[PDB]
């Protein structure tokens, strides 16, 4: 039933008595459901240390992964180039998913094509798909460049991307000079960040490998910036803003901020902004190259040092106070530009915010996850704030990374109760927040299901989620946020302390019970 002037959506419509009795009869009648006390009993079991030990013995089963496959990263990297169409050689369903995944996080159009490889091509190869694919995409969506990656069926089959593209051009399907960089992106190797690295290195060597003879390091007086897999628009924006404030010349290599934030002004813009082919051709002439997320840009690093002869600085992701300081000082030394008053003051305003909020941040225990560079940057900043990063989980992390984070933890008293986990998923993390309860989770939207699980045990056990990372599907426009630099540290500090104070307000809202501590001033 419905009241016309107060329409009910699924919630709370299905809480009306007649829907409840219907659902009760369906379950009792035909579902053959386990008794409720057996459900409550098994649930309690899943919150115990005993279950956790079984949970961490898993070898073959993954549950609720905190990572994606390589081609997702090759797509995002390609989208950062001017009028470039990402092209995933292989089966089409992959691309449907890649677009939907990014659609829901950015709430923007996301352009990507497949050559719709089929079980037939599994026998004689996808060569014909590439030839018709490239010619169709070029003529239909008129990109200036087509950046090719692969789905996992193409990798298994063994399609030689380089030869298929050369032949496409040889047989006339696309012009010889039309740029078609490529990268093999096997889903069964690494994760989505590896796909980013592979694509970018592929694009870099396409525009440079055979033209090194005329290159001179430093001749264009710029600094190459490689952002990596990055899904906050404000992180592309803050970097470019800080370098302009310093008078530093720079080339941001892979810049998707324009295309992922076009205005709604009556027309659709498939392409916007992005790194130019000519910035890439001229990149070897830079003073040097800075990798903003070095722990998933290893292949890129070998190419820029091996071919471009740049001496890539050892720098952590510019997150938090110290690592932003180090970033700006290394940029200053390379460029010969001093750090301007406007960044010195912004730095002090961050510190002022730190001193202002430290009493509510001190000792706060956190579980967190994400990609390796983002995770270690968050760990560093938490330690700078006096917080304790109790559970640190990076599904696509490795041993060398874990040793670096462990050393960061050991250099501070706020890391003494922290443990770093690699290769574990969000079902592992669920056990950790039950057996060693933190105060909050810092993670992506998949964390909302762990919060729900914790609340079900009891309100005293609930671990609220703070959404920082990727993907964020259940809040609007957080992709506009910033997490790098002083600006990003300011935003994270604000989100953290206010998440603490909002939760305190909830627990002290009880009239005559707990509202003695419901202070107006905090």
């Amino acid at each position: 039933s419905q009241q016309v002037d107060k329409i009910k959506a699924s919630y709370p419509l299905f809480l009306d008595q007649d829907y409840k009795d219907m659902l009760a009869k369906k379950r009792d009648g035909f579902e053959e459901k386990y008794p409720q006390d057996k459900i409550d009993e098994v649930f309690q079991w899943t919150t115990t240390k005993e279950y956790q030990e079984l949970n961490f013995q898993r070898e073959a089963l993954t549950v609720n992964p905190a990572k994606a496959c390589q081609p997702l990263g090759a797509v995002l990297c390609a989208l950062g180039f001017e009028k470039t169409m990402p092209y995933v050689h292989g089966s089409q369903g992959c691309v449907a998913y890649y677009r939907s995944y990014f659609n829901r996080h950015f709430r923007e159009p996301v352009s990507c094509v497949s050559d719709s490889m089929t079980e037939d091509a599994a026998v004689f190869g996808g060569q014909q798909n590439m030839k018709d694919g490239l010619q169709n995409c070029k003529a239909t969506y008129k990109p200036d460049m087509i950046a090719v990656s692969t789905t996992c069926m193409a990798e298994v089959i063994g399609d030689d991307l380089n030869a298929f593209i050369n032949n496409s051009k040889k047989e006339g399907f696309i012009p010889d000079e039309f740029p078609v960089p490529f990268a093999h992106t096997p889903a069964f190797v690494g994760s989505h960040v590896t796909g980013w690295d592979n694509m970018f290195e592929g694009i870099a060597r396409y525009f440079t490998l055979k033209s090194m003879d005329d290159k001179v390091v430093g001749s264009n007086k710029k600094i190459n910036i490689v952002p990596g897999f990055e899904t906050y628009l404000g992180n592309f924006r803050v970097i470019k803003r800080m370098l302009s404030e310093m008078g530093v010349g720079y080339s941001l290599l892979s810049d998707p901020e324009e295309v992922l934030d076009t205005p709604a002004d009556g027309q659709f813009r498939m392409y916007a902004g992005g790194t130019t082919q000519e910035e890439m051709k001229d990149a070897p002439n830079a003073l040097n190259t800075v990798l903003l997320q070095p722990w998933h840009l290893e292949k890129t690093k070998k190419f820029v040092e091996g071919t471009w002869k740049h001496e890539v600085p050892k720098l952590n992701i510019p997150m938090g106070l110290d690592w932003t300081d180090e970033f700006l000082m290394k940029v200053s030394e390379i460029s010969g530009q001093p750090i301007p008053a406007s960044l010195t003051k912004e730095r002090g305003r961050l510190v002022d915010m730190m001193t202002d909020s430290h009493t509510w941040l001190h000792g706060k225990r956190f579980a967190l996850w994400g990609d390796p560079d983002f995770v270690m940057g968050l760990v560093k900043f938490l330690l700078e704030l006096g917080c304790e990063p109790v559970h640190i989980l990076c599904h696509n992390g490795n041993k060398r990374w874990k040793k670096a984070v462990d050393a960061i933890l050991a250099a501070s008293p706020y890391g003494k109760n922290a443990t770093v986990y690699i290769g574990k998923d969000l079902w592992h993390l669920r056990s950790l927040v039950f057996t060693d309860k933190p105060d909050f989770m810092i993670g992506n939207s998949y964390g909302k299901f762990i919060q729900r699980d914790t609340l079900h045990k009891g309100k005293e056990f609930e671990v609220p989620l703070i959404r920082i990372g990727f993907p964020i599907f259940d809040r609007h426009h957080l992709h506009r946020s910033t997490t790098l630099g002083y600006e990003g540290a300011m935003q994270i500090l604000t989100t953290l302390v206010n998440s603490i104070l909002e939760r305190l307000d909830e627990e002290t809202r009880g009239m005559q019970a707990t509202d003695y501590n419901h202070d107006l001033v905090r």
Binding site: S1, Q2, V4, K8, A9, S10, L13, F14, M22, L23, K26, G29, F30, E31, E32, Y34, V42, F43, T46, R58, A60, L61, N64, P65, A68, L72, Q92, G93, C94, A96, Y97, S100, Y101, N103, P109, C112, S114, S116, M117, T118, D132, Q135, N136, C137, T140, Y141, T151, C152, M153, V156, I157, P186, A187, F188, P263, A264, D265, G266, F449, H456
Partner: protein
């Protein structure tokens, strides 16, 4: 129209190369009432042209994301690399009642997370170990399905042997599903693969059993995936009419419900495309008749309630008119409020395999006109059903390309578009109100009388929203 539409079709296709132009021409047609065989005017269920940005998914989406995933008390393994199960985790709102992680598992992502070692040596030993770990950590699961991703078939794995062996060892239902994404040309074959897996590994295991107490009014909702609660808003009406809905395939469905279906008297098929296969099997093996029905909007819902009631006796037919009289004042107030605000506005649709024709009546019940529609993966029998619901001279498009859709919208200029997430933000930027017709834009349900209220509210809130006035700056 008519002439202007065919001229628009030729103008759009002038950008394609020869091969694609000649193919895409066969997938675009103008509806003509003196031509009722869709075969004589449009081709469908063909391979997608490479590199034209099709909206289609794959057979894994058709089987795991559509048919199997919603079954709530089973654990479904995304067998292969990590991507497939992550991108489709919780993306489809096939609602259900349960305790997630304990006795229900719909929004969780189980996967074997293939590494390169599994590509070289094979994943069957990994699968066997994975099943044991599932059993130890999720004891209350009532059966496992193994949804094959692209690599499984290509490397020569034998997931059927693992299923038979482990199923016998543990005395558990383990369903191998060969829905590798490279099979077929779209999600559609995944439906078929999925329907056959149900028939071969689940549906025949209570042929032996009679312990079920049947009634002359037992039915099954075949092909309702309870998007936003759509199936619950339909079940309620069927049970108010006096019927007993024994199972819901697969929206909020349990495996035990599925196993009970061969005992019903009538299979009520909402989604013909995804489930006509198993409906046809159940008529052959068990003698159960099946009928298509439509719960989008009051007109179609009333017609369907009466058509279903005519398959039973005078008592059901009487309760049918009682339900129609009960809800009459409710949807009339909805029309009385929202039709004036929507009448005369034109709509263009593009969706999957049923809604492009099924929701037309609901729009008409609000005075709206569907000037164009199309499917991602429909067959010709779908289009036969579509030619009857669509008006004369309207535009039809099968497996539409992003370019085609954009160009048709620019010339036709609809007041509203209803499509998917990959299309929503394109047309919002062009200044055209958009409503997702897959996920219901996180609203719904839209089935039944209670759903029509939300549908009408939703079309009105979007079409007449003040944001559409302000896209152009007063200075341009």
């Amino acid at each position: 129209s008519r002439e202007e539409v065919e001229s628009l079709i030729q103008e759009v296709l002038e950008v394609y190369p020869e091969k694609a132009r000649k193919d895409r021409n066969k997938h675009l047609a103008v509806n003509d009432p003196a031509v009722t065989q869709s075969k004589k005017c449009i081709i469908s269920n063909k391979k997608s042209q490479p590199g034209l940005m099709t909206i289609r998914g794959c057979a894994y989406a058709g089987s795991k994301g559509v048919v199997w995933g919603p079954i709530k008390d089973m654990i479904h393994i995304s067998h292969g690399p990590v991507g497939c199960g992550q991108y489709s985790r919780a993306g489809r709102r096939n609602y259900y009642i349960g305790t997630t992680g304990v006795n229900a598992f719909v929004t969780m992502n189980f996967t074997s997370d293939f590494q390169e070692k599994d590509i070289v040596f094979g994943g069957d030993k990994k699968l066997a170990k994975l099943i044991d770990e599932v059993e130890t950590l999720f004891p209350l699961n009532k059966g496992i399905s193994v949804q094959s991703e692209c690599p499984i078939g290509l490397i020569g794995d034998d997931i059927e042997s693992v299923s038979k062996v482990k199923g016998a060892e543990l005395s558990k239902t383990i369903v191998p599903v060969r829905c590798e994404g490279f099979r077929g040309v779209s999600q559609s074959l995944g439906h078929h693969i999925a329907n056959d897996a149900v028939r071969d590994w689940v549906l025949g295991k209570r042929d032996e059993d009679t312990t079920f107490a049947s009634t002359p009014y037992d039915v099954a909702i075949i092909g309702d995936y309870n998007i936003g609660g759509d199936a619950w808003s339909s079940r309620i009406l069927l049970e108010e009419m006096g019927l007993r809905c024994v199972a819901q395939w697969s929206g909020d469905g349990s495996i035990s419900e599925i196993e009970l279906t061969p005992k019903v008297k009538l299979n009520l098929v909402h989604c013909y495309r995804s489930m006509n296969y198993i409906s046809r099997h159940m008529e052959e093996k068990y003698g159960i008749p099946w009928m298509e029905y439509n719960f989008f909007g009051p007109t179609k819902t009333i017609e369907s309630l009466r058509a279903i009631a005519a398959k039973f006796d005078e008592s059901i037919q009487k309760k049918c008119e009682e339900v129609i009289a009960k809800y009459k004042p409710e949807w009339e107030a909805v029309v009385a409020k929202y039709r004036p605000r929507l009448e005369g506005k034109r709509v263009m649709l593009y969706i999957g395999g049923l809604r492009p024709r099924h929701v037309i009546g609901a729009y008409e019940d609000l005075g709206m006109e569907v000037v164009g529609t199309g499917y991602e993966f429909a067959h010709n029998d779908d289009y036969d059903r579509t030619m009857k619901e669509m008006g004369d001279s309207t535009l039809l498009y099968d497996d539409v390309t992003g370019y085609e859709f954009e160009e048709f919208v620019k010339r036709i200029k609809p007041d509203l578009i209803g499509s998917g997430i990959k299309e929503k933000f394109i047309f919002q930027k062009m200044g055209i109100p958009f409503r997702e017709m897959h996920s219901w834009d996180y609203s719904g349900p839209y089935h039944g009388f209670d759903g029509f209220a939300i549908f009408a509210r939703d079309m009105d809130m979007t079409l007449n929203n003040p944001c559409w006035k302000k896209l152009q700056a007063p200075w341009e």
